[PDB]
Amino acid sequence: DGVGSSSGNWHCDSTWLGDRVITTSTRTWALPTYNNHLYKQISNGTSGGATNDNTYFGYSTPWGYFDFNRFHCHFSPRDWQRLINNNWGFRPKRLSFKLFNIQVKEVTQNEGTKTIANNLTSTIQVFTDSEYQLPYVLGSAHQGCLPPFPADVFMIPQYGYLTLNNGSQAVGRSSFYCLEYFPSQMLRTGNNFQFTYTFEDVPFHSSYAHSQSLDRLMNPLIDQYLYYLSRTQTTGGTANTQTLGFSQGGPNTMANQAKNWLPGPCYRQQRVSTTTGQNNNSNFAWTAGTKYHLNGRNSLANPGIAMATHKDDEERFFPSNGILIFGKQNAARDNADYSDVMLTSEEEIKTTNPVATEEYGIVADNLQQQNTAPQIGTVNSQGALPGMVWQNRDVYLQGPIWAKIPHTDGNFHPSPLMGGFGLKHPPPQILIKNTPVPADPPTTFNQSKLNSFITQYSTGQVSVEIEWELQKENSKRWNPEIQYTSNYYKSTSVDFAVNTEGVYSEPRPIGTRYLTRNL
Amino acid sequence: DGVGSSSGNWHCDSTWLGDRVITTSTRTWALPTYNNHLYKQISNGTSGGATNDNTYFGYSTPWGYFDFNRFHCHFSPRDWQRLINNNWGFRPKRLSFKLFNIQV
Amino acid sequence: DGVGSSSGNWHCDSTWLGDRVITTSTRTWALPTYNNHLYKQISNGTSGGATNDNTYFGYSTPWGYFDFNRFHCHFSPRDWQRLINNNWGFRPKRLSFKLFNIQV
Amino acid sequence: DGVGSSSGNWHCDSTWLGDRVITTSTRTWALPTYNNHLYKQISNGTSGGATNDNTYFGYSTPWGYFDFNRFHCHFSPRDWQRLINNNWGFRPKRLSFKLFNIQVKEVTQNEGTKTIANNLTSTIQVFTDSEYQLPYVLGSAHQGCLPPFPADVFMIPQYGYLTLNNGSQAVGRSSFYCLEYFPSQMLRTGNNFQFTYTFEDVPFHSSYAHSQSLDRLMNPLIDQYLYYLSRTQTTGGTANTQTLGFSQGGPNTMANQAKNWLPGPCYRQQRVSTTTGQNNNSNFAWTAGTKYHLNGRNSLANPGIAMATHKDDEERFFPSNGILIFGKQNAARDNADYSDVMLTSEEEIKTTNPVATEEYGIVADNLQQQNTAPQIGTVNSQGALPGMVWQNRDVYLQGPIWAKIPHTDGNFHPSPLMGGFGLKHPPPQILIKNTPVPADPPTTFNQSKLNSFITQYSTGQVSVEIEWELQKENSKRWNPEIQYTSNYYKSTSVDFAVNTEGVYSEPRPIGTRYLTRNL
Ligand code: NA
Ligand code: NA
């Protein structure tokens, strides 16, 4: 381990071995000094115009962190295509992480003149929250992950966290965490860091779409032996009185047939069209938003439980806050136009999951008698019911991979709503920080903590290797399947490539459900 | 032991084992040149307004020194709470000290 | 086992061993004759003012029963404090029950 | 272990073996039901006429306890005489305790007619506070110890204790103890109990008087080589001016001689004569009492540090609260007459310890000059000084044996002031209680704790055997020693024997210091 010796090589590749695929990606990173080496209490109350739904109390820290919770951090577009076009499923098995070729640079600023040089003896500090003692900030769809394109140099995100709050104030249970309290490895140029991790057992992601629907599992050609109430009143003319008539469900009465299952849970969202002219002329994104109520404040149930984005022929419709939406390259942070973002679609699950913008179904609302007509009620919120079956939200090339399951007494189907794998012991948080280097101190002793430091930052490479287990497709479907494919005809540029300006871009969201499977 | 190699890691932690608790803390320090590298006779007599109760004779040296004779140098607030809320007593047994990642 | 010999001692205590705590409590009890040694059908219908939400049918028996389904049956206030101030969790593992020094 | 079988024999004896003496005594006891089987908060504040110096907060318990912390519980008068007339010292080594021949009786009360019968199936509970977790109530000179006379049946004392208080109220640190929280042995008639204990290493008690005094250790016949300032002014007539004259201490100037030691510490007490006519005519027992000030309240330093009761020829004088005082048989509890009590005397220690009613000595009080005569100050309170030597208070046949040293960070010469051996781990407290036996309960369930119990009490024997180590006398004194002796001439009764009424009595206090020893 010396100044003149590399401490690691560039490992970027993918190998397919059978029921496994191993991805490996390396990137060059840059880490500045955050918070001026300080920890700062940050808060936001209800003063000014800040609403109560957005209050918070927490801290910003001088630390940065590595994040690769995004599929494109590991799969190239072509690899993603190889995965989704041929496998009914897949899942993470184990990973290796490495930090190397570290270099700490210090910048001198005198008379407009700026010079940067190495500080051969400075160190960075690194450690993993292997015992999950820090607030788990990963799994919240934050920016700062390794770039999709291998040639892009990225900046390391700053670590910050939240605790309990009451307005802009802290409460008795509010917790303060000092990351310097943890043992951490100190590396100088020449030193490297690495660790291994094994994923817990988790189900394969459903990278397939159903080629059958819950309400169409019977034999088209045979009647049931079971009967259903088919008539409640006579029909012979005008002397119509009450009676009781029963019939057997059959090919023409599939909606009446007795069935064994029920569609998945529902939490109805407001519908909105991509054809603005068809929408009400008001600003309802928030006022008509589907939300949950937690201790006084409201949050969008975004994207909320997995529901079909729209029913047959209505591609223009989508749940106001019930789908993942990515931005196109350079889309504005605020009020970006529809043509600057990319809406995803969980259309593939219409097959088992209720459509996100409609009722779950209908229930009786009273007791009918001869003097009281029967009444019905529309169900727009339907929790788990015995016999329900459903699918989870799909995952995307540019979407999240996993999330830490909250440590609670209970929960229900812990599949992270934004999509992905829910893990009790997810990949550990990897914290990194440039060690503060005092600028000359006074010549006579003083109690005060130093606050004058040499200006510096660090850079180096990072590698992440993940082994994935594949669940091969075993279909007897005779006719060809749907497959993700590149466009055929000429185009100004190549999809999933760089610009004349060297800018890489992801033209569209790529899901995972192309192959089909029976129910 | 080289220019490009760290000579120690950051050890800051606490472990409770039964009738023992081990504290470990690391800090970053800075040391200036003191007394211009000199030893100086320093004194204070009874002239001016200086009272006799405060007279003294000694020396200032070009040296610095490490001091961790203060409980919070070892126990975090929470650890101190764990200690005082559950034990009738405690006492120091042994220690390890280390200086590393030195840069002039 | 004789008239003049105790058939058990008073065990009331608590011991903390690490990831375990063993509670032990003894009490003196009294048992009368219930229901005049009889089993009786007991019922409550919707007559008088008794609402339907409270109707019931069952039996009262000549038997008594032991119950210690209440944490204070095992933890003293101080022990409860030792438990809740230092542990993220706890749970029951096994138990021993004993009846002795019986006198009719 | 049966109803018809004794569970122990009567062991009362003494055997002398050399440097050891083993005492053994058995007594018959009776234990009633205390506090109606209840624990009760007891308090005493500053209301009515109750002074602040006497406030307190604590609890009375349903338990009784065994106490044998009194030498006459083990030594007969003759044995005590054998001990003190022949040994320079002695100390406790180990003990055995036993409870047996237990019988629980229940009393029926109907129409003035009272009958008592056995309750063959009832139990008593016994246990030792072997880990010193309960307030140590022994060592406070309380009544209730085994009787001096073997034939006397005694009643077991009730256990109660005190915690912190503020007036008649408790405070945050006040502790409540439940003795049923402790494991305890349950015995029916037929069962027995016993335990063993070993005394910690402790110095031999000084059962001797010094035949030399601190200020008379030199050779009567030789001068010192050392000099002392003997003259400060000339003497030749009236032209007397200052000068400096020095001399050598010698046989006629022993008070001036240089010496190596200093008399023991001092805490001056007010003197009082047994000839009432010589005392001031006022009620000064409390107002002139020697006391210590602890958190707002005052206590008599009684008897306080060990000091000689009186100097030569003043047997009639004694410290108002600086000596142990026992009562004669049947002396009233309150305002007993002088002729009804027995004052002890620590006269034997005049030899090293200051007299309790005089100064420790004299010190300079200023800086003398030619224009300022020297001044002196009388010292009435003198704490430990390098070079001091002293003796402890003597112990008495009817006095206490040991006391538990308070659990504190520090202390000084932990010899219990009332006299005896100070132990960090003294004999454990032995608690005993009759188990409550419900009288018939109601026939239909009720939440309330039972409060109706069968009336009963218990009785049985108790044995205590203690082994004492003796320090034999090794004197070369030619002439006979002083010895405790029975009176020679006729008397109405025999000292240390019973009455025509069968009442045993101890005519006088018997100390321990008869043999002599050089310094
Ligand atoms: Na493409
Ligand atoms: Na006598």
mmCIF file of C-alpha atoms in Angstrom, chain D residues 58-174:
data_model
loop_
_atom_site.group_PDB
_atom_site.id
_atom_site.type_symbol
_atom_site.label_atom_id
_atom_site.label_comp_id
_atom_site.label_asym_id
_atom_site.label_seq_id
_atom_site.Cartn_x
_atom_site.Cartn_y
_atom_site.Cartn_z
ATOM 1 C CA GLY D 58 -40.368 4.405 58.517
ATOM 2 C CA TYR D 59 -42.367 1.216 58.764
ATOM 3 C CA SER D 60 -43.405 -1.332 61.324
ATOM 4 C CA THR D 61 -43.533 -4.923 60.036
ATOM 5 C CA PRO D 62 -45.414 -8.114 60.963
ATOM 6 C CA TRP D 63 -42.030 -9.739 61.639
ATOM 7 C CA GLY D 64 -40.064 -10.437 64.781
ATOM 8 C CA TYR D 65 -36.309 -10.975 65.061
ATOM 9 C CA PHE D 66 -33.739 -12.745 67.207
ATOM 10 C CA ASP D 67 -31.108 -10.750 69.013
ATOM 11 C CA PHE D 68 -28.285 -11.965 71.238
ATOM 12 C CA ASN D 69 -25.995 -8.852 70.942
ATOM 13 C CA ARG D 70 -25.416 -8.608 74.663
ATOM 14 C CA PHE D 71 -22.630 -10.455 76.440
ATOM 15 C CA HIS D 72 -24.839 -11.888 79.190
ATOM 16 C CA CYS D 73 -26.700 -13.785 76.469
ATOM 17 C CA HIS D 74 -23.632 -16.011 76.362
ATOM 18 C CA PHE D 75 -21.580 -15.645 79.526
ATOM 19 C CA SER D 76 -22.866 -16.487 82.975
ATOM 20 C CA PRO D 77 -21.627 -14.161 85.726
ATOM 21 C CA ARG D 78 -19.041 -16.714 86.837
ATOM 22 C CA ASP D 79 -17.860 -17.267 83.266
ATOM 23 C CA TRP D 80 -17.535 -13.533 82.753
ATOM 24 C CA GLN D 81 -15.406 -13.490 85.887
ATOM 25 C CA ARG D 82 -13.231 -16.344 84.574
ATOM 26 C CA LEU D 83 -12.754 -14.340 81.384
ATOM 27 C CA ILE D 84 -11.916 -10.896 82.796
ATOM 28 C CA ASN D 85 -9.714 -12.046 85.665
ATOM 29 C CA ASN D 86 -7.339 -14.040 83.483
ATOM 30 C CA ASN D 87 -7.166 -12.722 79.948
ATOM 31 C CA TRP D 88 -5.691 -9.615 78.402
ATOM 32 C CA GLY D 89 -8.198 -9.955 75.597
ATOM 33 C CA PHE D 90 -10.757 -11.975 73.672
ATOM 34 C CA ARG D 91 -12.870 -11.889 70.518
ATOM 35 C CA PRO D 92 -15.664 -13.724 68.662
ATOM 36 C CA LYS D 93 -14.627 -16.345 66.080
ATOM 37 C CA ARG D 94 -17.701 -18.235 64.865
ATOM 38 C CA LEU D 95 -21.266 -19.148 65.847
ATOM 39 C CA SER D 96 -24.073 -21.657 65.324
ATOM 40 C CA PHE D 97 -27.714 -20.730 65.642
ATOM 41 C CA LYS D 98 -30.710 -23.023 65.934
ATOM 42 C CA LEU D 99 -34.525 -22.821 66.174
ATOM 43 C CA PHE D 100 -36.401 -25.938 67.245
ATOM 44 C CA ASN D 101 -39.258 -27.555 69.189
ATOM 45 C CA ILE D 102 -41.572 -25.123 67.508
ATOM 46 C CA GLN D 103 -45.234 -25.074 68.453
ATOM 47 C CA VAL D 104 -47.971 -22.897 67.023
ATOM 48 C CA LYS D 105 -50.981 -22.340 69.229
ATOM 49 C CA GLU D 106 -54.336 -20.840 68.384
ATOM 50 C CA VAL D 107 -56.615 -19.166 70.914
ATOM 51 C CA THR D 108 -60.425 -19.302 70.787
ATOM 52 C CA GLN D 109 -62.331 -16.512 72.504
ATOM 53 C CA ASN D 110 -66.020 -17.225 73.229
ATOM 54 C CA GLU D 111 -68.134 -15.735 76.160
ATOM 55 C CA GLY D 112 -65.317 -14.580 78.469
ATOM 56 C CA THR D 113 -64.183 -18.202 78.139
ATOM 57 C CA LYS D 114 -60.668 -18.464 76.635
ATOM 58 C CA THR D 115 -59.110 -21.703 75.370
ATOM 59 C CA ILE D 116 -55.717 -22.350 73.776
ATOM 60 C CA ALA D 117 -54.913 -25.350 71.609
ATOM 61 C CA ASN D 118 -52.326 -26.545 69.132
ATOM 62 C CA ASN D 119 -52.594 -25.923 65.430
ATOM 63 C CA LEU D 120 -50.496 -28.805 64.356
ATOM 64 C CA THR D 121 -50.497 -27.706 60.686
ATOM 65 C CA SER D 122 -49.506 -24.016 61.066
ATOM 66 C CA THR D 123 -46.078 -22.663 60.163
ATOM 67 C CA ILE D 124 -43.618 -19.989 61.228
ATOM 68 C CA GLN D 125 -41.272 -18.411 58.699
ATOM 69 C CA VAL D 126 -37.572 -17.799 59.278
ATOM 70 C CA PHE D 127 -34.728 -16.366 57.286
ATOM 71 C CA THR D 128 -31.399 -14.597 57.663
ATOM 72 C CA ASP D 129 -30.556 -11.288 55.989
ATOM 73 C CA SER D 130 -27.283 -12.896 54.869
ATOM 74 C CA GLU D 131 -26.710 -10.329 52.144
ATOM 75 C CA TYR D 132 -27.465 -7.368 54.399
ATOM 76 C CA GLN D 133 -30.289 -6.081 52.248
ATOM 77 C CA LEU D 134 -32.563 -4.959 55.092
ATOM 78 C CA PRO D 135 -31.955 -2.006 57.402
ATOM 79 C CA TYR D 136 -29.649 -3.392 60.098
ATOM 80 C CA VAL D 137 -31.575 -2.766 63.288
ATOM 81 C CA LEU D 138 -29.283 -4.726 65.613
ATOM 82 C CA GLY D 139 -26.504 -2.725 67.264
ATOM 83 C CA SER D 140 -28.751 0.044 68.626
ATOM 84 C CA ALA D 141 -28.948 -1.270 72.186
ATOM 85 C CA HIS D 142 -32.600 -2.322 71.919
ATOM 86 C CA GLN D 143 -34.363 -4.583 74.416
ATOM 87 C CA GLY D 144 -35.553 -8.005 73.323
ATOM 88 C CA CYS D 145 -32.290 -9.964 73.466
ATOM 89 C CA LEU D 146 -32.147 -13.437 74.974
ATOM 90 C CA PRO D 147 -32.452 -13.065 78.810
ATOM 91 C CA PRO D 148 -29.338 -13.275 81.043
ATOM 92 C CA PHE D 149 -31.045 -15.968 83.132
ATOM 93 C CA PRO D 150 -31.602 -19.286 81.261
ATOM 94 C CA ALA D 151 -34.930 -20.018 82.953
ATOM 95 C CA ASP D 152 -36.609 -16.802 81.776
ATOM 96 C CA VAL D 153 -39.027 -17.112 78.868
ATOM 97 C CA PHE D 154 -38.816 -14.073 76.617
ATOM 98 C CA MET D 155 -40.896 -12.296 74.017
ATOM 99 C CA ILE D 156 -39.520 -11.723 70.514
ATOM 100 C CA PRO D 157 -39.067 -8.043 69.503
ATOM 101 C CA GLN D 158 -40.981 -6.659 66.551
ATOM 102 C CA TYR D 159 -38.975 -5.575 63.509
ATOM 103 C CA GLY D 160 -39.326 -2.010 62.297
ATOM 104 C CA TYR D 161 -37.026 0.380 60.446
ATOM 105 C CA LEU D 162 -36.485 3.987 59.383
ATOM 106 C CA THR D 163 -35.664 5.695 56.033
ATOM 107 C CA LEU D 164 -35.182 9.259 55.077
ATOM 108 C CA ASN D 165 -37.711 11.853 56.121
ATOM 109 C CA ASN D 166 -38.505 15.533 55.951
ATOM 110 C CA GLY D 167 -40.576 16.281 58.996
ATOM 111 C CA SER D 168 -43.237 13.580 59.058
ATOM 112 C CA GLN D 169 -43.121 13.121 55.309
ATOM 113 C CA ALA D 170 -41.111 10.718 53.195
ATOM 114 C CA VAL D 171 -38.824 11.917 50.406
ATOM 115 C CA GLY D 172 -37.844 10.615 46.984
ATOM 116 C CA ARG D 173 -35.062 8.391 48.309
ATOM 117 C CA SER D 174 -37.183 6.849 51.032
#
